[PDB]
Amino acid sequence: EDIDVILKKSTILNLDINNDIISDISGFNSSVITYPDAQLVPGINGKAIHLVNNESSEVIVHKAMDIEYNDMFNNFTVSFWLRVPKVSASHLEQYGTNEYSIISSMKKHSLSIGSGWSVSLKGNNLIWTLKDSAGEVRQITFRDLPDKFNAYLANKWVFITITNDRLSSANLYINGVLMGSAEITGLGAIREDNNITLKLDRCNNNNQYVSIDKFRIFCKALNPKEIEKLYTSYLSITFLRDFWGNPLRYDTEYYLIPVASSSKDVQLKNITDYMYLTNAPSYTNGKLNIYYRRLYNGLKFIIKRYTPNNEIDSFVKSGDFIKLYVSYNNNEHIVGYPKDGNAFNNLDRILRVGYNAPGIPLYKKMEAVKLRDLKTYSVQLKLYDDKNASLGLVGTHNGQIGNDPNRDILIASNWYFNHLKDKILGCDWYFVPTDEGWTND
Ligand code: NA
């Protein structure tokens, strides 16, 4: 049967945010109660829910009468986008044994035995718990990757899916890939609360927050092909995305990191001159088994509109024409290629920052595009000359300029157009904005 049909027909709850109101769009009309300090922030396709650590920051879904999806051995799947800040070393030491729920159907401290399910966090662990009407429990505990640049609980939007087959296992997926599993046979009936609560419960860190988007429940255990289609269905191409998965924005400082060389930063030789890569320093902590290349070193770039004639949007759309600037010594310097400027073998055109030679045309019309690698939050940049001919995608080339050391130098080249299906490509860039959810230790 057709996967899109299966996904639609089996949906019994689906939270959407429209006109700054959270509601259920499944067709079953569960009631959604938004408490005063539940916040809305940018999400994977619109806005998302943002929860901070106080009693007022919660969203409660009161299930419609008609939806009993998970009682009496019925199979079910819960999915949602999740964004959790990178936990500091200090906070892993202080709070790393504190398990706190963020989404739950279990009623605690009341008459109920507490049956239902929960999503919880504990340090760098993501935990799925089921509890039946007799109080018996099953859990999945997923331990995140140690390299926080590539980890799932380290400030990027990631897509969670938990399937529950009452005759076999619960299975945790992240970004469509199976990450954890537990047998759940032997559990009895689940008698959960009429409410599903999105709230930090029993979190000891006052400064903790999370973001949750597209919360959804299905009345079957989705299979891997279904989960892959569901995951990719959300990756809308309208707007480009920054490193964290949020919409890319105009007039906002970003550090650039090449996807194909992710432990490199970008540096400027001098005003009017070229840019090149350097090695990023790393933070390591063996005791905690975390490490990562440090962020926020290197040049700050700003994307400006090329010549707006319609509506001003703060977000950058794929296909927008832009001017790219470097913010350096309290000014903004255009990035472009001068006519007849230095190039490698006449084809790999060396970019220049703040070039200003009198009488020399400087080509600076760019287009911000997403031509490849749908699952990765990366961007390509295309440069045009004054006759709107392509001078290439922005990438790097190894070589030397004058007597300088050998460097990986930023260029524009049309070579990349013949290689867009490659797994890794040197024209793919991460745009990384400074963010409270990632501070280097
Ligand atoms: Na090259």
Swiss-Prot record:
It comes from the Bacteria. The chain holds residues 875 to 1315 of 1315 of the full protein. Signal peptide: none annotated. It comes from Clostridium tetani (strain Massachusetts / E88). This is Tetanus toxin heavy chain. Disulfide bonds join C203-C219.
